Structures are given as structure tokens and as C-alpha cells.
């Protein structure tokens, strides 16, 4: 499944690219993951955009 | 690690109980697990707390 490690720098592209997938924590420092199965197509996109390198499929 | 499925009833027992792991997504209808890795002892208490066995360990 999609996780998000500690490089996470709170860019937050992930958020905009694929809301049904990445939302923000309540501190606001780190994404979380709603879906870790999600096949969307806005997952690859997130990965691809995640200036940290933050998203992996575990 | 820490899943919720679909059984989420929104109970957001969880939530109270152990909120450095659980958070409700924006919709407000499914817990998002935070740290999905989390040794916390709370784990343990929103498990056995949640009404639908919504949280697992996958
Ligand atoms: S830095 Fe974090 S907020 Fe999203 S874009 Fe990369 S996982
Ligand atoms: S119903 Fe859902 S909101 Fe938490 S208490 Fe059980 S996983």
C-alpha cells in the first residue's frame, strides 16, 4: 500500500493532485493516507510530484 | 500495520481514544490512521473500543 515517510517536507502537492487519496494532518506537517490500496491514476501523478519523495507503495 | 475498513460506522471512538493515530477523514464518515506503524498503547484501547471492528492489523 501508498505510505508517506518522514522526508514528507509538507509540500502538500500530493493533496491538490489526488484529494481522494492524500489529506493533511491536523498539525499540518505531514500527509496522511485515506486510501493505501487506491488505484487511482492521480496516485502515480502524487509520487511523480512529490518533491521529497515522500510516497511509496509498500 | 493499522487499517480501518469499510465497517467504519464513524463511531469516532478512535478519535478520542488515541488521536495521535486516528483522525476522521473530511467527509467526516471514515477514520484515516495517521501512523499506520504506531506501537502506542492506545492502539490497542481504539481497537478493542470500536462498536463495528472497523480497525485492523493488516
Ligand atoms: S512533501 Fe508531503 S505533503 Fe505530499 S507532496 Fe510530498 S508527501
Ligand atoms: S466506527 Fe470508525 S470512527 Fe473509529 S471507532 Fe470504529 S474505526
Redesign the interface.
Known sequence: ?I?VNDDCMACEACVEICPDVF?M??EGD?A???N?DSDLDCVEEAIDSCPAEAIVRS
Chains 1, 2 share one sequence.
Open positions: 500500500p505510505e489529506e494532518n491536523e505531514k496522511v493516507v485515506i493505501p
